[PDB]
Amino acid sequence: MSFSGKYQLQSQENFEAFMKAIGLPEELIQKGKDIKGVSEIVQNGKHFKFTITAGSKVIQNEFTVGEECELETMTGEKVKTVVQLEGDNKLVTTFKNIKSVTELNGDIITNTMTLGDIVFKRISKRI
Ligand SMILES: CC(C)(C)c1nc(-c2c(NC(=O)C3=C(C(=O)O)CCC3)sc3c2CCCC3)no1
Numbered sequence: 001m002s003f004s005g006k007y008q009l010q011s012q013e014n015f016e017a018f019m020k021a022i023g024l025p026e027e028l029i030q031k032g033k034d035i036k037g038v039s040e041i042v043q044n045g046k047h048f049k050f051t052i053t054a055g056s057k058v059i060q061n062e063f064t065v066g067e068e069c070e071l072e073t074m075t076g077e078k079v080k081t082v083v084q085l086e087g088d089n090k091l092v093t094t095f096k097n098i099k100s101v102t103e104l105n106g107d108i109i110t111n112t113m114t115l116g117d118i119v120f121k122r123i124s125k126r127i
Contacts, residue, residue: 001088001123004043007109007124009036019119024074039124071095
């Protein structure tokens, strides 16, 4: 099953709480909290390219699952980690104490990022 596609954010929970917890300037939080942009995934086998719209920032990540890679953070910083496949439809990874799980079901992607007790959840639909 392939993740490839262009996805528009439908809804999200805890954007503000999550962004505050990672130290985003309140100014970038209010500007970005209501943006419903488009995220793109290009999948080639175990190689993924992500162009993500997160609030008012565009985040870019390329990686091969199982290999070491660098993920870009909201704050601009790069972090070493590894992204795994769990089943055919779940990408799982951890960085800066954040547990992320990105799951595809048909045309719906559910991105769940957990930091402390904050569950930041984003739901996007293929366009
Ligand atoms: C999945 C992977 C590569 C591990 C990854 N996701 C992110 C990532 C997000 N991703 C999404 O929102 C996504 C979609 C969507 O728009 O709902 C559809 C696919 C991903 S938001 C976000 C970050 C990091 C810092 C904080 C804010 N970073 O790496």
